[PDB]
Amino acid sequence: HGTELIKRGFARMQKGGVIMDVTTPEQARIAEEAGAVAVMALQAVPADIRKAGGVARMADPEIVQQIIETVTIPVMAKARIGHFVEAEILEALGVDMVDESEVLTPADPFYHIDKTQFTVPFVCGARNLGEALRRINEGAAMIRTKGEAGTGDVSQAVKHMKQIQGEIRALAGKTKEELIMVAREIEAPIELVVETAKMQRLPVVNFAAGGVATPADAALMMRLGADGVFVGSGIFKAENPEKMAKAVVEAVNNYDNPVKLAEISKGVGAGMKGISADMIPAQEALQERGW
Amino acid sequence: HGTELIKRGFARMQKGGVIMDVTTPEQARIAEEAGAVAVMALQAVPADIRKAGGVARMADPEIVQQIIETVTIPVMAKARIGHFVEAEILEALGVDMVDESEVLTPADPFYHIDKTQFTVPFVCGARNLGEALRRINEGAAMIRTKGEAGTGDVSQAVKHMKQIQGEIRALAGKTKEELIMVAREIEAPIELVVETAKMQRLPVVNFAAGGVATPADAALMMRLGADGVFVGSGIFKAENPEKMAKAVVEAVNNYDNPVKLAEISKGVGAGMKGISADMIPAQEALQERGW
Amino acid sequence: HGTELIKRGFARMQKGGVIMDVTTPEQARIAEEAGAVAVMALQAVPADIRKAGGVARMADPEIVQQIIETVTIPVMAKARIGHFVEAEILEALGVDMVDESEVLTPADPFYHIDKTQFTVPFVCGARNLGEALRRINEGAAMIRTKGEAGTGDVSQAVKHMKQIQGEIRALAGKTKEELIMVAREIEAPIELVVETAKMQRLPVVNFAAGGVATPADAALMMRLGADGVFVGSGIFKAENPEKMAKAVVEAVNNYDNPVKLAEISKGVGAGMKGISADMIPAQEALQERGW
Amino acid sequence: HGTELIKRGFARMQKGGVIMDVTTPEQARIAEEAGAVAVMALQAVPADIRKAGGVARMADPEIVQQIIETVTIPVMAKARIGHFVEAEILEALGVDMVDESEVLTPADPFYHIDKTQFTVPFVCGARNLGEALRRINEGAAMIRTKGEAGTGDVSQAVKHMKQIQGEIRALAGKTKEELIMVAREIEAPIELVVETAKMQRLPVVNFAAGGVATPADAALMMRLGADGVFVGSGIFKAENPEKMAKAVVEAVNNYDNPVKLAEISKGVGAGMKGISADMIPAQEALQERGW
């Protein structure tokens, strides 16, 4: 199987980019022209998944094969939580990274995949520091904040990004006898809590996902310490997907220049009509999945 | 960056005036002719925001650019709570004051902007004396009562205005050992609670907002000690926006002359059909935002 | 009045020493010969105060005058909480430092003395970081952990010493927006929480008090980061006060040399028969005083 | 410092023996003649500690020096929980093993010693599998069940011995995905829970302590899987310490021969008058210490 370094060397190439979720070959072609670094083939954007309801599963193998033949950038895919056979079918198709999505219906209500047995690197969700460290223990090669997929509200993504980054800053200065106590409270391996405290960052690349809907929200996450952004319903549910796409990609490249950001936001168009994240009942919140 | 005095010298020029919220260049032209002191460009008046629902964001940069070119009085804008990048884009556009509105959807559920790092002065909401003093600590150059935006009921604005002004009157006569105890109960800096107690007023200009719907309500707030009034849905959701506008502006200039106030109120027209503030559930109350 | 620097320059001379509580001139003479740095005149050691009960007050002015004439090292005294007139009488007698003791019966159930109006430096108790910072705000020139006076159990002193020092280590690495949140939770001035976080120690000298009963416990507190130790009932309620005194003084000077510590502990004698700190009801715990 | 193997090679020499707690040189001489493998010097047997109350501490250094000069078998000692300076003084005296006893008054209510920094091997208590694995993580070179010291009731020791050994038997057959779930429930390192499951025993020597009072109880613990027995108040609080001593030592050597055990128990004498373990309130139970 692929060494952990090489899986933690496919996740580092994605730094400072944008990943756009697409459903058809034409949408995949659009994203590549805008300058994206990867695409995420799925049957329907997270906004539609809330609307349609029912049971969501892995995309049809026919679609993921067509997108791959259409773009040159790496292609990712989604699999249900704990469905180690779905992740086997995607890997055989040639995807470069499999995303254990909480958007799709969980298949195993207790366990996640055993990601160390596979070769393709994975990406997993995380709400706090405890969840980030457990996932890396299982072999996750990247982490992305859960947020609230399909709502267009960046309130939840910022909350989870300050929880992960807020805790990692407190670990500085603590003594060994205390870092052992923290590992108990957050229920994380003690080997990682010491590796994190020495580095002051998650030992794997960390992205932002859920609620990114405008060029301003994209550059906000990069100013909180993210290495990139996952943009889904925000672009292709907007007024003009083509214009919004180039704006978001350019926003991440100039997240620290206020003068330029004003230029980008002009003429982009109206964003997706979201849903207030505080309006969603807890039982309906996708973020609650991924124990 | 701009010195606190100059930011606390742009907020003082607005004393004894009216600020009217507008959405289109024509509405901006209307307000200026009525004699207003400033306009607040936004995508939709707070009355529509309740009706439309969804996620509300910063206005389109194209609109704020058009209003600025249309009026000579200063132009303000709104930004979401905690979205320090949106406040960066507005400042680059040339607005003279950015309003951290609780009407829009909060972007950060824990923190507000760090307003001391910017040059354009800010304005922030407040329900009591504790909230007013914390905001000024962060660099707010003006305070306005939250009220209940979009309801047309002046019950909530009066309540919050007697909470802020009622507390500042109790601080007179107290001894140092006691002013320290108050700062604990209201959770405010002790340096400000002593500056307030010596001045018997908020050290920054204070306006009234939310529920002002008639020339009588406008002059009521000025008789409770306000320095001005923020009028939003009240004017342009009324029967005749043009006539209501001149009446409200004239009401604030004669708030202490009963004979004249009768003359102003004649022929103005029917006010906006409001909503009883006591009918709104707490979870739906915009005033609860702005912790 | 004495400048805060000079009061924070009388507290620094006491670093790396032992302060022994004495009741009679002969006990005061004993402590000086053992090499102590100061004595604390009081009517009865904290062990007797629990036994006798009743109301405890400031020592008789006749006693404090006799001790001062007997020793050359500085003489301290105790005063009740909030009794600003008792602290006035001691200062006139010539004591060099007044100790706002929680052992004595509180006189004011809401407020402490206003220690900035006096010239003699003060010392005050503290259970956590919040209490340490409030006391320094009022003008305290030294801090000592409350512990559980008169029990001979070093369990409580260690607990409070890891609470104060444990919190100061977490403050390293935090950002300004977060140090403001901490100051709210611990209810401390924001100016101090930033001074502490930059220094990684309390800005004033910190001692250990309560439960020190053997040469081992004395060197334990110095190994947790204390600058000294307050030893009360431990020495003069032991089998041989003369031998225990020289041992404790020598323990603090060799707290980091295991070979020597064994030599000191040989032939010292039996320590005071203490009381298990977990056996004391909360209403009877002296540490609960000093809100 | 001593390698973990050598500390886990001083604990293995004690297999299949008896360790007798002694207070005076004569008692130490008695135990050696009976054929014991080690002695545990302390100020008073656990039976007296309950009766005397107060605060219990490390023995006088004079006593531990006298016992060592009297016997040829290794000499152990006790230290309070979390008192890393007391364990330093004993090591300098020449003891071969330091016992972090829960019988003595805890000195640190949150943490135990950091036993990896020392050279002398340690022994620590344990009520279940979770506690046994955490202690070994810190560097414990032996484990002994807590039981209920000083009661003479073998009900509690058997309970804890079936908890530790009962859990280790369930771990057989489980899959990796499940051994990770167990490590969460028992809050133990995942590296040890896999080492235990492969060996089907604690990776360090395990003894029995608390409630052993007769030659029958001694051989009962050895039939439940113990490697030895710690006998304290049982022998020297009995009718005839000399006869009981040889009986208990001989019981452990013939724990599996019913015919011989009858011969040993004849003429031994009356055992210590114990206290029913179910009569002791939880707050008074020594076993509750050692979190």
Author numbering:
A (entry chain B), B (entry chain A), C (entry chain J), D (entry chain I): 11 to 301
Task: Tell me what the authors wrote about this structure, in their words.
Each monomer adapts a triose phosphate isomerase (TIM) barrel fold that houses the active site for deoxyxylulose 5-phosphate-independent PLP synthesis from D-ribose 5-phosphate (R5P), D-glyceraldehyde 3-phosphate, and an ammonia moiety from glutamine. Like other homologous PLP synthase structures, the M. acetivorans PdxS dodecameric complex consists of two layers of homohexameric rings that stack cylindrically, with an outer diameter of 108 Å and an inner diameter of 42 Å.
Our structure shows that the native PdxS monomer fashions a single 8α/8β TIM-barrel domain, surrounded by seven additional helices to mediate solvent and interface contacts. Monomer tips also interdigitate at the hexamer-hexamer interface, creating altogether three distinct types of lateral contacts that give rise to the dodecamer, here described as AB, AA, and BB. The first 10 residues lack clear density for modeling, as was similarly observed with the Arabidopsis thaliana Pdx1.2/1.3 pseudoenzyme structures, indicating that this region is relatively flexible when unbound to its glutaminase, PdxT. The M. acetivorans αN helix displays several solvent-exposed hydrophobic residues (I16, G19, F20, M23), with regions of dense negative and positive charge above and below, respectively, which is highly suggestive of a putative binding interface for the glutaminase. In our maps, no instances of PdxT binding were observed, even after extensive 3D classification and examination under a low-density threshold. Based on comparison with previous crystal structures where PdxS was co-crystallized with R5P and various intermediate states, the density is most likely to belong to either bound R5P or an R5P Schiff-base intermediate.
